[PDB]
Design an enzyme around this catalytic site. Structure first.
Site, mmCIF file in Angstrom:
data_model
loop_
_atom_site.group_PDB
_atom_site.id
_atom_site.type_symbol
_atom_site.label_atom_id
_atom_site.label_comp_id
_atom_site.label_asym_id
_atom_site.label_seq_id
_atom_site.Cartn_x
_atom_site.Cartn_y
_atom_site.Cartn_z
ATOM 1 N N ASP A 122 -2.939 2.829 -10.548
ATOM 2 C CA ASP A 122 -4.145 3.547 -10.903
ATOM 3 C C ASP A 122 -4.667 2.989 -12.223
ATOM 4 O O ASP A 122 -3.957 2.279 -12.942
ATOM 5 C CB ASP A 122 -3.861 5.043 -11.004
ATOM 6 C CG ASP A 122 -5.123 5.872 -11.086
ATOM 7 O OD1 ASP A 122 -6.180 5.431 -10.547
ATOM 8 O OD2 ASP A 122 -5.019 6.954 -11.686
HETATM 9 C C1 LIG Z 1 -7.387 6.070 -10.863
HETATM 10 O O1 LIG Z 1 -8.431 5.131 -10.773
HETATM 11 C C2 LIG Z 1 -8.559 4.548 -9.487
HETATM 12 C C3 LIG Z 1 -9.702 3.462 -9.595
HETATM 13 O O2 LIG Z 1 -10.910 4.116 -9.859
HETATM 14 C C4 LIG Z 1 -8.955 5.675 -8.474
HETATM 15 O O3 LIG Z 1 -8.977 5.087 -7.200
HETATM 16 C C5 LIG Z 1 -7.823 6.748 -8.471
HETATM 17 O O4 LIG Z 1 -8.289 7.806 -7.676
HETATM 18 C C6 LIG Z 1 -7.649 7.290 -9.922
HETATM 19 F F1 LIG Z 1 -6.593 8.132 -9.950
#
Ligand SMILES: *[C@H]1O[C@H](CO)[C@@H](O)[C@H](O)[C@H]1F
Length: 559
Positions: free
Chosen positions: A288
């Protein structure tokens, strides 16, 4: 090499595709391999140049924030033709082409995942996935950071909620597999998230490292069951998030000390011990977003970035300071925080997904212009209407004779907006539409702000003379870095006269608002605040359309 990875699910590459991966890998410098590990975020604001993602290194992927489909298509052409290695192009296509703070600005907003779940028809989730991938692929997206297979166990969690398919693991499995089916029809990779599983804690990993504190056995029987099911179904990629599972970690490593327990995105026990080892996940692991507090607060950044890769992540999602982050990776490789052998294995899995998509052999970098006609197509708008028809849920109906609404039963309506958004002019576009559609039916409708309220100069009898019905339009939406999506009043506008004036409460997002308005006698969950859901709400309130939704969660949250 890497035939044991690249020839089987979810890669299934041919001999010649594996030869391309290997030959490409061998040709890359260490700096180029390190760059392949990085996904860079892209926004469309004047003064921001998309090719800035290539000033400090050559990235392996980009993700588009929500801007216009036509600009995404132009960005894909510019980015890909400027890249020696084709890019994976990702997007948070959560609710269709648009909706949910991700996707594109002008795509089709179908529904939140929970609204889809309320239909209890996996074809709804297949259609959702088709819209996401159909509209995304038209502009060059080849990777959706979805589906979310978190379990909405904890109703106070602000970052799960309507982004999930609810709180039943079996329904989550059904819906997520169907979403993936819809995406694979359009050649778009999917991403199961957020591993090791949001929804147990009540806190946001954007703001801290949140904690899945189930016992190892409890976790295995719920989250582990879901992850195993999607892995076997062929999930191509997985997102390791900034969430700890201390009890699973200790199961793998009984001697680990509390301070050594890392979130998923940094944890060898979770990514290598559980995912690679126990579950034999063979696809791509990405973190993430690495600028979030849950990541940054867990370890000094210069150590964290190479350690994520060493401990099982194949790709780092986003940089903070890009010069510093890349230097941290260079130094981690040279000093042994990241091994050259693990670097090659991560890049092999990245290149393998690019070969799976056949990006190297694609002559054109986007589909024909004709493909853009799928965006906001009649088919996609139709599916959004069907899902709204099937999703809206009558939760509580203890107001004899209230429904169906009729101007001849309640002519004068006060409409009370409650939201955590800040729309220009004060009123949500969708609530304005709802107001107008009530007026079309023959109701007289004023906003709460337009009329008097009980006080020293206006009585409850006056109110009853002037008001036949209160209607609440509640839209408390998920958004990064909020510690609550609880009902907040902007508290005289709360439902404080439910025994003096009939009051109807409509939630177009958070399904748990009975937590803050338990006195309300008629309560409906619609899960999504878009035009399609507003129009179908009108039909159902007027009795021209039955309520068909089934709560995919306990809306009472334990009373
Ligand atoms: C963390 O960021 C990513 C990229 O934007 C998202 O897909 C996840 O939902 C978030 F938790």
């Amino acid at each position: 090499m890497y035939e044991s990875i690249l020839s089987i699910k979810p890669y299934n590459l041919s001999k010649e595709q594996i030869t391309w991966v290997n030959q490409t890998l061998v040709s890359l410098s260490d700096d180029e391999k390190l760059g392949q590990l990085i996904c860079e975020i892209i926004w469309d604001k004047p003064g921001c140049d998309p090719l800035d993602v290539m000033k400090h290194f050559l990235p392996g992927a980009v993700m588009y924030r929500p801007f216009k489909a036509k600009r995404m298509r132009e960005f894909t052409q510019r980015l890909q033709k400027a890249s020696k290695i084709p890019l994976l192009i990702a997007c948070n296509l959560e609710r269709g082409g648009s909706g949910g703070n991700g996707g594109m600005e002008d795509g089709t907003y179908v529904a939140s995942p929970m609204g889809v779940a309320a239909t209890d028809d996996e074809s709804s989730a297949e259609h959702l996935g088709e819209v996401c991938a159909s509209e995304g692929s038209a502009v060059g997206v080849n990777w959706t950071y979805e589906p979310i297979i978190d379990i909405d166990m904890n109703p106070e969690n602000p970052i799960t909620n309507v982004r999930t398919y609810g709180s039943d693991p079996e329904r989550i499995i059904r819906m997520a597999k169907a979403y993936c089916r819809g995406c694979r029809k359009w050649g778009v990779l999917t991403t199961i998230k957020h591993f090791p599983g949001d929804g147990v804690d009540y806190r946001d990993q954007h703001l801290m490292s949140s904690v899945n504190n189930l016992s190892a056995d409890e976790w295995m029987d719920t989250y582990g069951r879901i992850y195993q099911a999607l892995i076997e179904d062929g999930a191509e990629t997985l997102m390791s998030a900034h969430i700890r599972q201390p009890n699973v970690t200790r199961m793998v490593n009984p001697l680990i000390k509390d301070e050594e327990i890392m979130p998923g995105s940094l944890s060898k026990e979770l990514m290598q011990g559980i995912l690679r080892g126990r579950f034999h996940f063979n696809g791509l692991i990405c973190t993430d977003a690495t600028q979030m507090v849950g990541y940054t607060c867990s370890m000094p950044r210069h150590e964290a970035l190479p350690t994520s890769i060493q401990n099982g992540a194949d790709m780092l999602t986003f940089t903070l300071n890009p010069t510093e982050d890349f230097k941290a990776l260079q130094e981690g490789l040279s000093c042994g925080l990241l091994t050259h052998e693990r670097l090659d294995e991560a890049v092999a899995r990245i290149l393998g997904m690019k070969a799976k998509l056949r990006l190297p052999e694609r002559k054109d970098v986007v589909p024909p212009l004709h493909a853009m006609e799928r965006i906001q197509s009649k088919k996609h708008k139709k599916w959004a209407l069907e899902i709204a028809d099937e999703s809206i849920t009558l939760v509580k109906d203890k107001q004899k004779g209230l429904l169906p609404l009729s101007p001849q039963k309640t002519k004068r309506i006060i409409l009370v907006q409650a939201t955590n958004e800040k729309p220009e002019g004060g009123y949500l576009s969708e609530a304005r539409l709802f107001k107008g559609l009530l007026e079309k039916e023959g109701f007289i409708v004023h906003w709460f702000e337009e009329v008097p309220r009980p006080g020293t100069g206006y009585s409850i009898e006056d109110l009853k003379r002037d008001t036949d019905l209160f209607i609440y339009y509640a839209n408390f939406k998920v958004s990064s870095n909020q510690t609550t999506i609880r009902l907040v009043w902007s508290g005289d506008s709360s439902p404080k006269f439910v025994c003096d004036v009939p009051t109807l409460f409509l939630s177009f997002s958070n399904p748990y608002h009975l937590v803050d308005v338990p006195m309300v006698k008629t309560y409906i969950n619609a899960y999504t605040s878009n035009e399609a859901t507003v129009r179908m709400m009108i039909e159902k309130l007027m009795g021209r359309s039955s309520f068909k939704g089934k709560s995919p969660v306990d809306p009472f949250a334990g009373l």
